Ligand binder design. Structure first.
Ligand code: NA
Ligand code: NA
Ligand code: NA
Length: 105
C-alpha cells in the first residue's frame, strides 16, 4: 500500500546510472517516440544481481512492447518502437544490492 514510483523523464539518446539498493527494487523511466524506429535499450548490471527490465507502450500496460534479455552483464533489446509514450521498468527480483547503467539509443 504505497505511492507509485516517480517516473524519470528521459529521451531516446540517454545514458544514466541508477541503483537498486535495499528496499528500492524498481526504477521507472518514461520517454516518447515521435516516429517508428528501432531503438536499443541496454542496462549494464554492474554487480550481477537478479535484475531485468520490461517496457510498455502507454496503450498496453499488460503486454510488453519489449523486455531485456541477459547476455552476461548486458541486459538488452533492439526492436522497432511504434510512436507514443513508453514506460520502462528497471527492477530486481532477488535480494542483491547493485548499481546499473541504462542506455537508450
Ligand atoms: Na533506484
Ligand atoms: Na526506485
Ligand atoms: Na560483459
Amino acid at each position: 500500500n504505497n505511492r507509485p514510483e516517480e517516473a524519470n523523464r528521459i529521451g531516446l539518446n540517454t545514458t544514466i546510472k541508477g541503483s537498486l539498493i535495499g528496499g528500492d527494487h524498481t526504477d521507472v523511466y518514461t520517454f516518447n517516440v515521435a516516429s517508428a524506429k528501432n531503438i536499443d535499450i541496454s542496462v549494464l548490471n554492474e554487480y550481477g544481481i537478479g535484475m531485468t527490465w520490461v517496457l510498455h507502450h502507454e496503450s498496453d500496460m499488460q503486454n510488453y512492447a519489449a523486455y531485456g534479455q541477459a547476455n552476461g552483464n548486458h541486459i538488452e533489446a533492439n526492436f522497432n518502437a511504434k510512436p507514443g509514450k513508453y514506460y520502462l521498468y528497471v527492477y530486481k527480483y532477488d535480494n542483491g544490492d547493485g548499481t546499473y547503467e541504462l542506455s537508450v539509443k
